[PDB]
Amino acid sequence: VLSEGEWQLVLHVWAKVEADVAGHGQDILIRLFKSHPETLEKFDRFKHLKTEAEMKASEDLKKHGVTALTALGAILKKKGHHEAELKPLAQSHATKHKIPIKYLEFYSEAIIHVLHSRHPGDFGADAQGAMNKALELFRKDIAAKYKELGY
Numbered sequence: 001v002l003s004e005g006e007w008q009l010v011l012h013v014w015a016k017v018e019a020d021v022a023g024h025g026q027d028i029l030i031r032l033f034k035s036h037p038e039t040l041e042k043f044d045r046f047k048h049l050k051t052e053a054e055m056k057a058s059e060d061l062k063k064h065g066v067t068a069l070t071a072l073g074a075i076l077k078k079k080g081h082h083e084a085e086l087k088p089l090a091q092s093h094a095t096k097h098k099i100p101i102k103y104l105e106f107y108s109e110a111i112i113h114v115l116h117s118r119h120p121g122d123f124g125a126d127a128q129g130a131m132n133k134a135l136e137l138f139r140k141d142i143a144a145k146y147k148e149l150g151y
């Protein structure tokens with residue numbers, strides 16, 4: 001149920017991310033990993049990383065950050081009409097990576113943190129409202145896919 005004004009806010013925020021997708025993606029994964037160390041353990045690709053310095057130094061962590069946020073940007077730009085884009089992420093995250101929905105909530109929290117940290121006094125309360133709505137929609141739709149699959 002996001003309004004057009006709300007989707008406009010979400011995509012105006014996302015334009016901030018797009019100016020440095022690798023920077024934002026890295027910061028988000030690092031915030032996630034250090035706030036909820038159980039999440040790192042889901043990444044066989046990254047679980048050798050122990051310290052924040054090692055995470056910050058990982059070029060491959062940046063690369064994956066780009067992959068993840070590129071998908072999210074594509075989803076957001078569909079303005080809720082994201083059945084096709086969301087299906088493959090639902091399947092992979094439920095059944096292959098085995099990511100609890102709770103972890104997607106932590107991922108959403110990390111995005112909001114990173115946006116405030118990178119854009120202090122430039123991430124408006126209206127835009128925080130709208131981004132929350134957009135992420136909540138994404139989680140709701142993914143979660144239904146997980147339920148279907150017994151997850």
Ligand code: HEM
Nearest residue numbers: 039042043045067068071072088089092097099103104107
């Ligand atoms: C905004 C939410 C998320 C988006 C948009 C996203 C997107 C993606 C994309 C596009 C891929 C590569 C294609 C795929 O395997 O489906 C991927 C891989 C993966 N994601 Fe996510 N993801 C999200 C959340 C999470 C969370 C919260 C976790 C774990 C706590 C996670 C764990 C993984 C893992 C393990 C892989 C495979 C990485 C590899 O070994 O190469 N994802 N994700």
Ligand SMILES: O=N[O-]
Nearest residue numbers: 029064065068069
């Ligand atoms: O960065 N999550 O795939």
Ligand SMILES: O=N[O-]
Nearest residue numbers: 031035109110113
């Ligand atoms: O990372 N959540 O504050």
